Design a binder for these strands. Structure first.
Lengths: 122, 142, 62, 207
RNA sequence: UAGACGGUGAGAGCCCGGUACGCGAAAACCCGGCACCUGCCUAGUAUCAAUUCCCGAGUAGCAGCGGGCCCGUGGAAUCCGCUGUGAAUCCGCCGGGACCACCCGGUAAGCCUAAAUACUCCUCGAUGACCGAUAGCGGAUUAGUACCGUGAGGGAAUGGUGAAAAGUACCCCGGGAGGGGAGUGAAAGAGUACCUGAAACCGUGUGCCUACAAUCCGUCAGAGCCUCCUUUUCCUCUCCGGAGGAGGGUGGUGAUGGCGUGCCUUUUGAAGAAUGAGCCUGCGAGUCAGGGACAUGUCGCAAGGUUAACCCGUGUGGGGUAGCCGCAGCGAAAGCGAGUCUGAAUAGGGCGACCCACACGCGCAUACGCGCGUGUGAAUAGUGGCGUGUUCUGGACCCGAA
RNA sequence: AUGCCGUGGUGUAAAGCGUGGCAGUGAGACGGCGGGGGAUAAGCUCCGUACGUCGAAAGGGAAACAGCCCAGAUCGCCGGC
RNA sequence: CGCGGCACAUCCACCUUGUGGUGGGUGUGGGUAGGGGAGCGUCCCUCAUUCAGCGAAGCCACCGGGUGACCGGUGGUGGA
């Protein structure tokens, strides 16, 4: 039974080239190039899911650091205070209350100050 | 009916079409190199060049006797468990009961005491055979 | 269409009463003068083939 | 184990029994499946055939000398990668029915008939006629009243009165003979309408 | 007795051609039927000593060299060729695998001889888990054509409007092609560039972005701009809905940031300045045959399993018991047998025969459990089919030389 | 010193051995230590090493980076150490 | 590590205390050559049933879904 392998192939072809729209070049157009790019796009998106976990953490850290240094304390000592005080907030919500509430963040900074030991010995 | 017919789960195995995409058995189909095996098949004789185990060993001693008088045997103990009563048997009765093939010359072997009163007709008795069958009341024959 | 038994290896191998193939331990044919008797009662008999020569020998026997 | 059914211009006669090999041989649908598969395969004419290279016309010329063209070394205009060139590993005129055993075949058959008698779907009859002139009017009447189902088997025999001459043209109704009785057809068929001569000689040959 | 199949404006047993079934013929060819014509024998068949002759000649044999046979000249017969030499006529020769004696089979050197057997240019009938325009014939279409070559030779491509041609009358732009309107048609989103109309490719328009800016051309985070959609401040004209909009949701696009060295083959190693690919669509590579070899999954039956060719039948159904394998092994083999071979020997050993938590009764025992069949019911095996993997002989995964 | 062989004990999940089906592989690279040939050379060549990694392993560090160090990705998270 | 969602292997308590399934505990889930297992999609034949000139296939677009092959819905085209 000679099969005429068109339909079977056009399935995945239309797959790739609908998940490939919006590509500058011969990539939304042609199929093999859309496939080369699909492999690269999905490794990029895979790497960027992890990468973005880490990157948002680094951004939040930059922000908490900026609000801390607005309160004359460094990010290191801020974290060591929010640890020793124990307020189990995390850098994400800590940065949110940093943005919207300078008041709540400065309460947090005074919390951290009140929970620093004495010195650079211990 | 026919819309209610399935094999036993265990048969009707999936054929392995090999060169079908690098997800099942992909490119090389199992001969995964550029070697000789990757295009053709080296025989079972060829061994690299050193004499194969079928050339360095010696041909087995002795000849084959063209006139080898091959028999078919029937077990005196299993001729007991063929005929519990017995009394009268003979080569035709063996092939009838299905103890040995047709077109045959028979020997009767000697494993197990034949404790049935039986007389047996069959060429070429063995030592223990004639012993047991002639001690079971009956005797041997030709 | 009808498989050939490799002749040369059926004239050198012997399927016994069960699944054993017995080669002939016979570097015992040409020069038997220097060879001590020990090395001939070492080379007089029919040795069951080892594992690392079986899977092929049987396909030579078929 | 026990049945018999009527005659036109009648109501009942016979009312007979059936041997052990027709009812209580356990239906083992695996065997039946294999055997009916082997029948299906026996059916196939198997006349697919395509010209592999060496059958394709011409193409015994190597165009384009090996080197110096810029092309690909081709070797024959009938290479399987060409157009019109050969088929590779193509369909050839196979002739494939499997050589199943006598015991398996007969046992599948009597398992299927065992099923039919287990439901009460066998309809043994004396003659499926009006008596001598093959008429499909009364024969359709007596089958679609004798059966009430859609598909019917009718085991008449090598006699034409109105059996294997008149009940044809009835879709759902296929006609057999007491010895070419088989598995695929008793399974495809819902009712298995016999003719007492067919049934009795069938029993008598199977014993 | 007709529900085959095909056509008719769709998918028709009942419209049509037909089918089922029945009729069917001058002449032809041919089956064959009877009579005519021709072809014999006017007993030597028997039994008979066996008085004698004959029974296929440069042949058989033998030697030389070859062929052929499983038989590679080997030790080789049987048969066949060419060269020498070269016979007999039955109390002869020939064969029985050198050869010899006895014993068997047959009478070569004349010729003829139906059947079962294979075959397909050809006509009829049929079918397909055969292909359906890149397929299937090289050839559906002026096909062995056009074209190529001096020649032998090679050798294509090219099918589809519609049910019906009703194939666009008529005006309009045009020199025509082409269109516009009209009209045909169910559909012109069927126009003789025509069924459906893919992708590459080529444009028109429209929302976003882009002229200080590098970055396998994406991905993630992401402002904004347009989008349709909407909850409401809202207008209370709510007795009809959306405006500038706030909350909100998908969809274009995406300013901007960070991350990031295409696919393949092959390689110690490739983004590689190694190979291959300009792109899209179609075609291109692990198949099948065999009562094959091995192993295994599943299924028949059971110390069996199984048929091969073939015979009957029309669904692959029923017969077919030749054979094959299993049933005993050992040994060069003669042979012998649960043993067998070596040997002087079983002493050993090599190969192969045999398995309980207890009996029955005993040998013996320190609680010991080795022994035997009957069992307490001791313990299982093959062979055939079907799938699977590998292997064999076949081009055997496809492609490729000189 | 190590390593190797055995036994004895504790711990440990498939690790081991026997027998089959199916393979591949048999061009290795660098790095640590031990050595040969080199010249007290090589991104050299050849060996040893229950040594490692790449091969065939991504992520983080090394500016960039097959073999170096941390670490072996089942998928998701705008969570922590 | 946390928290969710798949998968595999051994193990028990189980249902029918081996087939196959409930609960759990533990371990595990990079991967090339290669090995095993399970599967998607194309087309042809049968049985069953079912949709179709009210619109089949094919095609295109959108909206969804599956852990993957891929699947369904809807509209446009088309006209078996």
């Amino acid at each position: 039974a000679r099969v005429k392998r068109a339909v079977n192939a056009h399935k995945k072809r239309r797959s790739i080239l609908k998940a490939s729209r919006g590509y500058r070049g011969q990539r939304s157009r042609l199929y093999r190039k859309a496939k080369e790019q699909q492999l690269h796009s999905l490794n990029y998106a895979y790497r960027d899911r992890r990468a973005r976990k880490g990157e948002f953490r680094k951004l939040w850290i930059a922000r908490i650091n900026a609000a801390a240094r607005l309160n004359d304390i460094t990010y290191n000592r801020l974290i060591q205070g929010l640890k020793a005080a124990g307020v189990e907030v995390d850098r994400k919500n800590l940065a949110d209350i940093a943005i919207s509430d300078p008041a709540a963040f400065t309460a947090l900074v005074d919390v951290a100050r009140a929970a620093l030991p004495e010195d650079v010995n211990a | 009916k026919l819309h209610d017919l399935r094999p036993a789960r265990g048969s009707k195995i999936a054929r392995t079409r090999v060169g079908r995409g690098d997800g099942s058995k992909g490119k090389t189909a199992g001969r995964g190199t550029k070697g000789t095996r990757a295009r053709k098949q080296v025989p079972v004789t060829f061994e690299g060049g050193q004499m194969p185990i079928h050339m360095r060993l010696p041909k087995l001693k002795g000849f084959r006797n063209r006139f080898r008088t091959e028999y078919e045997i029937v077990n005196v103990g299993d001729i007991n468990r063929l005929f519990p009563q017995g009394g009268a048997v003979g080569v035709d009765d063996l092939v009838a009961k299905g103890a040995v093939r047709k077109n045959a010359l028979v020997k009767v072997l000697g494993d197990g005491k034949l404790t049935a009163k039986v007389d047996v007709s069959a060429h070429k008795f063995s030592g223990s055979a004639r012993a047991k069958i002639t001690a079971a009341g009956g005797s041997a024959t030709e | 269409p009808k498989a050939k038994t490799h002749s040369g290896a059926s004239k050198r191998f012997r399927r016994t009463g069960t699944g054993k193939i017995v080669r002939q331990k016979a570097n015992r044919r040409h020069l038997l003068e220097h060879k001590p008797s020990t090395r001939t009662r070492r080379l007089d008999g029919r040795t069951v083939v080892a594992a690392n020569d079986t899977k092929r020998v049987t396909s030579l026997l078929n | 184990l026990k049945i018999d059914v009527k005659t036109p211009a009648g109501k009942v006669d016979g009312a007979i029994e059936l041997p052990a090999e027709l009812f209580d041989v356990p239906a083992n649908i695996a065997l039946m499946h294999q055997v009916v598969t082997a029948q299906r395969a026996a059916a196939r004419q198997g006349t697919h055939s395509t010209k592999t290279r060496g059958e394709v016309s011409g193409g015994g010329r190597k165009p384009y000398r090996q080197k110096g063209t810029g092309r690909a070394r081709q070797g024959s205009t009938r290479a399987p990668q060409f157009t019109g060139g050969g088929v590779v590993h193509g369909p050839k005129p196979r002739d494939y029915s499997q050589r199943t055993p006598k015991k398996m075949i007969a046992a599948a058959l009597r398992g299927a008939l065992s099923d039919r008698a287990r439901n009460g779907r066998i309809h043994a009859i004396t003659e499926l006629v009006e008596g001598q002139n093959p008429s499909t009017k009364s024969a359709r009447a007596f089958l679609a009243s004798l059966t009430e189902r859609k598909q019917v088997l009718v085991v008449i025999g090598r006699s034409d009165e109105a059996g294997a001459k008149s009940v044809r043209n009835l879709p759902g109704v296929h006609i057999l003979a007491p010895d070419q009785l088989n598995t695929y057809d008793v399974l495809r068929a819902d009712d298995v309408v016999f003719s007492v001569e067919a049934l009795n000689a069938y029993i008598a040959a199977n014993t």
